Each structure stands twice: as structure tokens, then as C-alpha cells.
């Protein structure tokens, strides 16, 4: 929404840049004007053939006499037009170079200036400007927004003025040569703009319906794949597939309905567009029979008008490129034009010599850019004598850290002044002030250069002698010399990461080369290992003694030797004095001392599509007919102009033109009929395999075992996305792109035959010219992408050192050396600059070549179409036919290169989708094999079970676990922590087979038992019961599948679960909808329902996995009261964390490291004193 003045945007263009644009926009207008004139000449060549075409047939008497006057007229005329034609091509060759080269030159020259001024402005902002802004967005604003500015002031402006030249020049020739066709052509424009307007209303409204349609099926997939362990436990995998299959059935009916309507729309709009044109041309014919406009003049206007009419559309993108570059330049120039109060690039203020370093802080009130929300310093008074070292202590707020901030004048205070020596700090030059102040901060930062270079960031003029004395004066010399490469080592986020105490020592040496008169040490010892802390502390003590120093830290070891200590309470300076005096004061300071002491040939996807042997042959045969039918319109056009140029006696002409225009409209309606078929057939054929694919995938997905659904690769969202994308992508490959790719190869094929079977030596020439200009059009795009990738790689190195400069900004400004990063960024940009200079010459040459290759190709089309061909016995009507036929059949092949990624993006989506079906699990619920015992009573035997989870085979959970529980008794399961308690329930459900050992139920190993039948005897109840969106009766009846459960039966379970108070209180009762879609209720009712569906199954084994986990107050007392009634009649395994409710259990087992540690009845493990006795004691006391 915000934008820039047009003149301010070009503020960096002067002298030559203004001229380049002037000559550039000039030649660009010359380039545009060249095309409608080329069409004006195409009319004069027609009249030459038309005057001879009328007189040649007018004879029917003399023959050799027509070998004289006609050929002579053709000789002087065709040579004149071909001479003019060759001139236009040389014109476009020059102006198209001038057009693109000059504009890309001005673009490259200015963007170089923009990028330097921009980065200079970034480093010029004061710190308070950075505290309110995001540096990451700022750096991306540097590389991206400048690119948008470059796209808008580049060769696009030349293309814009080239287009308006065609537009103006087209309608000028349109009006002057005959303004009775222009107004007729404009009259059909609203119809074409209205038909394409129905497309923007149909596409936008129906694209939501499909994203709405599958969102109902993908919702089924979501609540299923999220509750996968519940449907797996209750075996609803046929139902959840059936539901998904039932929603897929509706999505395909809405998909074929959209295929019917969208193809009716496309064919009707195409027929309206072609009938609109054929009327404007048949109207053109009605004005030639009236002897008002020559047969060649109708072409001259009809072409120049339609050329300039579409030149509007070809200019609209360049308008958006310029406007976007304007608005992109707003926030950029806003930074450049913004002037700071602090500067630091300013050359102003005093530079005191013989600085003795007497600092004082006077009544300083301050607040960080958070402003009126917080005021961290309410008044202040602090002096520090020269040579002394004052220490600042404080409980919190870190108002200590603020004084170091103000001392470098990173901010100016709200009220009060900071005084170095006697002068106010704001009277001293900012840079010189930062140069007389050395800074060592808590987190040290080293730029990605050598050690000597990082030390060289203290002062640019320095020799390795000073570097050596500095690092030796910080006792950092000894440890770096052992490091290889000596001072020439590397540092940074990338490469040679060092100890913290060593990086700080380099930072102390960096600040030591500064030879500052003022020293500021902010928590430099804090957040550092204890051993190396003394090593750095020795250097800090050796860094002072020649300077006045303010130091802030939470280490009260470094503070004793300070001449003065200062305490803060709420930004107010409270206590000050020597260490001993503050202890006698027994104030804040004393208080803090005591406190701290694979693309491949996949035909089988087409073999699955072979379910429909028809519907394809219908579409293909219908598409090839539509292919063979398109050039016949060019054939009709060739003979509407052909018989009119070849007319001779004019009486027969007027009756023939009516017959052709009629047949055209009969071919158009027969084109509409065949287009709707090839669309509908492919559409329906695409929508049905969408169901088959999503059905087989969702079926095979419900086949895999819990081992697969635990994969971090496969989450519920990543599966629904893999489910939607892979099915829609393969539809596009076998869909429109194929019907089109066959319609077009038939379009060229039926066009190339007619052209080859007509004009001799004529088609053979055009077949030498057209492929070369097509290839030359391709190679230009390749060099364009290569230059684009190359320039992306080069400015990346610049923005990389810009990223380092601005992300570590607060450090660089503290060391000044901003001019250093300026010079580095400038040297980095110099290569893309000289690169951008060559880009203009290349871009202009390629564009001018492809334009000249199109214009010269046109001269050879007529000079050969006349002369050798028309001096013989070859007619013009065919040359026109071969033109439209070949040129259109080629431009129809241009759609093959556009649908190419639709094929690759589908094969990759097919690659996954063929494997996701074929993958088979270790435990397949679909296998009908298995025992299915007849004996009801259930035992459970865990024997020697070692189990590790397939996702984390690192820490084992079960190591030699052994339980046994008889029928009708409760097996309590206590554990120190982890799924060691829970893994029992998962293995009994046989979510996994154990690594070693085995688990039995009736004495039969479940591993050889039937998987589905095994889980059919289990009454699983988990922590968070997930209930699908349907009737609570269905959530209850979900407990028994393969049979519809009686209402009184699901009532019995709801009576059993004590949930019946709700189920009758509701208005809908058992038919109420739950799942946070129709109604919402608390977890206690959710659990009771899960208990009901558990015992609707009438299991012989309950499995209660921390059922009271998420529950509170009386809700626990009523759900436990329901669970306690559900067991005692069945085999039961309870792992609940309420050991008070486990007291009445037939056997309590303590799990330890996967082994059973203690076991026995409650009082038995209470008689013993150990883990279970400690478990019952800790949470009974707490
Ligand atoms: Br835009 C444009 C349209 C037609 C051009 O040549 C013609 C011309 Br002029 C007339 C017919 Br019919 C077919 C072709 Br191809 C040229 Br060169 C450029
Ligand atoms: Br009659 C008649 C035939 C073709 C005409 O131009 C074309 C041409 Br040339 C090719 C195709 Br495809 C469609 C149309 Br409409 C015109 Br205008 C009038």
C-alpha cells in the first residue's frame, strides 16, 4: 500500500543513467512500432498478388502475355517489399540491443549505488533503532527488496514502452487505414473479457468446494490416523476404511460434476472467442465486396489492431514490476534518508587530548526503548575517580549493565548527563569517544577471520609486534601458539570453536590494542568455567591499573580489590564505599555476600489405471480428432484469404465467403463437441482412480502395525498430506496434460502433412527456419538462468558478510570499525557490478538475436514464397496455409514443455504411493491365519520378555520380565517409572512381538495365535479415551465389531459404566454426537463411555492403563467406582498410579529395570519393606 515518488526512486540516476534510459526508451519505442508496420507491408504485398490474381484469371485467352506484365509487377513489387522487410529486421536487431542493454546498464549502475548506500545507512543507525527492529527481517530486506527494485528499473521498462509503441502504433495504423474495423473489433472485446471473467468466478468458487470435499474425507482420515491405536485395538479397520470409502464416493461424484461443468465452460468460452474473431473477419469480408477496403487493407488493420490490443496485456506485467519496485524502495529509502541523533559516522564534537578519565553520572533517568512501560533508572548519582576501579553490585534489574551502555553513548539519557572528564559526553565526537573506551562484554564474539584480524579490529594500523604484546599482556599468547597456524588460525560460528575463557582473552587483547583511557567490564567473568576464570581474571587485573574502570559482575571475588563498590536498589544508588565500609553498613552489599557464601518407468500405475480400458480411447480418439481439426481453421483462413486473392471474376466470390464462414462455425461447434468429450472422459477417468488410490492406500495404511505409526517420519499430519498430494498429483499426469499432449501432436501432425502435401520446397524451407529460432529461443533461457544462478551465488558472499556485520552489530559499533565493514561490503559488491555490466551486453545480444531471427525468418518466407516459387507454378494461398499451419502446430508443441513438471511431480508422488501399498508389516491384522481357540477362560503368562522399542533401541524398557495372572483375579502393576508398566498392555494386545522371550494367554503363545482374535478378548482402557465423532451408542458399540450391537446391549454397558446419568440427561440421549464437533463433555464421561465400549465386548481380559491419570475430585471417585465394578469378574491388569485403589488387588507386582522386583499381595509387600513399601509411603504422606 505505501509507495515512493517516481523521481525520488531514480535519485541515484544522473548524467549517463538519464541518457541510457532516454536512448533505451527511444529504441524500445522504435522496436514496438516495427511490428505493426511489418503488418502494414503484409497488406501491400497482398494487393500486388491481388491485382495480378484478378487479372491472371480475368484472361482465359492469352498465356504468354501473362508471363510478362504480371511477373514484371511481381519482380519490382516483391523486391521492394523484401528490401523493406530486410530493413525492419536490421532495425529490430539494433533497437532491441539498445533497448535491453541500456536499461540493464542503468539498472546495474543504480542498484550498485543503492546497495552501498543502504548498508551504509544500516550501520549508521543508533542502538535504540535496533532494539525496536528485527535484524533478520532487515537483512532479508537487504537482499530481497533491492532485488525487487532491480527488477522494476531494469529492461522491463523498455519492454513496457515497447508494448505501448505496438499498442499506439497498432491502433494508429488501425484507425487511419480504415476505422470501420477497429470499432468493430473493440465491440467484441467486452464479450471476451466477460467470458474469461466467468473463469475467475468458477475457478475460485469450485477450488474451495474440492478443498471442502476432501476435507470431509481427510477429516475421517485425521481422526482415524490420530486414534490409530484405538481402532487397531477394537479392529474397526474395515469400518474406518468403509467410512473413508464412503466419503471418497461422494468426493468422486463432486469431482465428475466439476469435470462436466469446467469442460462445458472451457469449450464454450473458446467458441465465443473464436466466433468473435471470425465475425470481425467475416465483417472484414463484407467491406471488400463493397469496394471500400482492399483485401490487403483488411489484413493490415485486422492484424495491427489485434496486435496492439494484446500489446496491452503484454505490458500489464511490467506495470506491476515497476509499482512493486516503488513500494519496495519505500522502506529502503526510509532507512537511507533517516538521519540519526547519535551518528558515529559524524565528524563533529571535541576530541580531548590528555584524557585523565574522571567520570561522573548526574541525576540520570533512563528507560530502554520499551519506554513508558518500564523505567529502569529513577535518578542516579555516581562518580569514579581517575585511576580508580569502581564496582557495581545489584540484586536484579541489571541497572548495573545500563551505566556501561550509557557510557559508550549507545543511548542518550532521558534526563541527566554522563560526564567523561569535565565535558558532557554529547560534546565529544562519538567515534573518538568509543575509541577512548575499551569494552569487554559477557558473551564475547569473534568475527570469521584470523586471530590477528580479530585483534586488528581494535585498530586497523597495527603490526604483529603489537598483536604479540597485546596477547602476551592478556596472557593469551601461550595458548594460541600451541594452536596450529599461529596467528593465522580461523574463528567464527563456522570452524575452530574454542573455550569461552580463551575467546574472552582474545577480546581483552582486542580491547587492549585500543589502548583506551576508559575501561568497561560487564560480567566478563560471569558465565564462565571456574578454572579458566582465574586465567582471564589475571588478565583483567593486568588490563586495568593504567586506566579508569567501571566493572559489573555477580562474582564478588573480583570486587574486593576495587577502590569503591556501589550498590543499587530499584535503580537508586544506595550504598557506596570500600568493601569493609559496606559490611559495617550491613546493607544490600552485605546481604548479597552472605547469600552467595526416484524417477523411473512406473507403468504399473498406468496398469492400475487400466481398470478403465474405455473412457481413455474415447478421449484419445476424441483428442486426436480435435487435433486434426485445429489446422483446418488455419486451412479455412488460408482459403478465405486464398480464394479472395485468387478470385479473378468477382461475382462468384461473395457467395463463396458465406459458405466458408458457415463451415468454420460448423467446425467450431464440432470442435466444442469433441473438446468437452476429451475433457469429461479424462476427468471422470481421473476422479475414479483417485478413489481407488486413496482407498488402497488408506487400506494398506490400516494394515501396518504400531511399529510403523510410531516412526517420527510418519505422523498423522504427514500421512494425511501424503494421502492427499500423491493421489491428486497422479491424476494430473494422466489427466489434462495427456489429453492435450495427444491433441497437440495430432495438431502438428495433421498440420505438417497438409503443408508438406501442398507447397513444394516451401515447407522444406520453413522446417529449416522454425526449429532454429525455437532452439535459439531455448538457449537464451538457459544462459538467462545461468547468469541468474551465478549472480545469486556472488551477492550471497556479500550478504553473508552483511549478515555477520548486522547480527553482531552492537559489538562492532562498540569497537567502531563500521567503516571497515563498509569497505568489505563494497569490495564484495564490485564483482557483481562488473558482472552486471556484462549482463546488459549479453541480455541485449540474445534478445536482439531472437527478434532478428524472427524477422529475417519472415523475409525468407516471402522472398522464397515469391521469386523462385511464384515465378514457377506455386500459389500464394498455400504459403499462407503453411504459415498458419506450421507456426500454430509449433506453438501447440510449446504446451509440451509447460506440462513437463506435471509429469515429474506426479511420478515422484507415484514413487511413494506404489511403495506405501506394497509395504507389508510383521504383525498384519488382515491375515486370516491363526488359531482362534474355543476355550473361554483366560490366563496371561509373561516369560523372559526382553523388549526394546523399535524407534529407540537404545535404553531398554523390558529386560527379562515375567508375570502370570490367573483368571478372574486382578494383577496390579507398579513401576518406578516409564512404560515398563505400560509395555505389558501393548504386548498383550500384540502391538509388538518381544525381542526375546514369549507371552502366552491360555498357554498358547500369542505369536502363533490369531492377531485379531487375540485383541478381540481384550478390554483396553487408556489414559485419554479418544472418541470418534458419532453417536455415543456407536462409540459404545465400537467395542464389538463384525456384529451390530443391540441397543439394550449398549444400554447394559452404559448402565455398567455409570454413565447413564448423562445418557438420559441429554436431549438426544444415546443419539447425541460427541467428539468436539456436535457436543463437548468432560473427561470423566469420556472415560465411562470407553469403559462401556470396553465391556460391550464382554472381554475376558480388562486392561486399565492409568485410567484415572487426567481426573480430579469426585470424578476420580466415580470412575474408580466404575472400574472397580468392571473387574473382579474378569482377568484384569491395572497399572493405575493410585496405589490407594490398588490395595484390594489379588497380586501387586513391582517392575524394576524391566525385571519384576517385588511381588505379592498388598499386606505381603507391606510386610516386606522396600520399593512397594516406599511407593505406598511417599504418596500417602504427600
Ligand atoms: Br505477431 C505476427 C503475426 C503474423 C506474422 O506473419 C504472418 C502474417 Br503478416 C500473416 C499471417 Br495469415 C500469418 C503470419 Br505467421 C508475423 Br512476422 C508476426
Ligand atoms: Br473464416 C476465419 C478463419 C480463421 C480465422 O482466424 C483463425 C485462425 Br488463422 C486460426 C484459428 Br485455430 C482460429 C481462427 Br478464428 C478467422 Br479471424 C476467420
Residue numbers in the entry: 30 to 626, 689 to 1273
What does the paper say about this structure?
The multidrug transporter P-glycoprotein (Pgp)/ABCB1/MDR1 plays an important role in multidrug resistance (MDR) and detoxification owing to its ability to efflux an unusually large and chemically diverse set of substrates. P-glycoprotein (Pgp), a member of the ATP-binding cassette (ABC) superfamily, is one of the most promiscuous drug transporters in nature and is capable of binding and expelling a very large number of substrates from the cell. The structures highlight a high concentration of aromatic residues in the transmembrane α-helices that form the DBP, many of which are directly engaged in contacts with ligands. The binding mode of the environmental pollutant BDE-100 in the DBP of Pgp was also previously captured by XRC and it was shown to be a potent inhibitor of verapamil-stimulated ATPase activity of the transporter.
Two mutants, Y303A and Y306A, showed strong BDE-100 occupancy at the original site (site 1), but also revealed a novel site 2 located on the opposing pseudo-symmetric half of the drug-binding pocket (DBP). To our surprise, two mutants, Y303A and Y306A, preserved BDE-100 binding to the original site (site 1) but also allowed strong binding to a second distal site in the DBP (site 2). The differences between the Y303A and Y306A mutants present a puzzling element of their roles in polyspecificity. The pattern of anomalous density for eight crystals of the Y303A mutant and five crystals of the Y306A mutant clearly shows a slightly different binding pose of BDE-100 in their respective sites 2 (not shown), yet Tyr303 and Tyr306 are involved in site 1 formation and are as far from site 2 as any site 1 residue. Furthermore, we detected no significant differences in the binding pose of BDE-100 in site 1 between the Y303A, Y306A, C952A or F979A mutants. A slight perturbation of the canonical site allowed a second copy of BDE-100 to bind to the DBP in some cases, and therefore stoichiometry does not appear to be a stringent requirement for polyspecificity. All structures were determined in the 3.98–4.17 Å resolution range and adopted the same inward-facing conformation as wild-type Pgp.
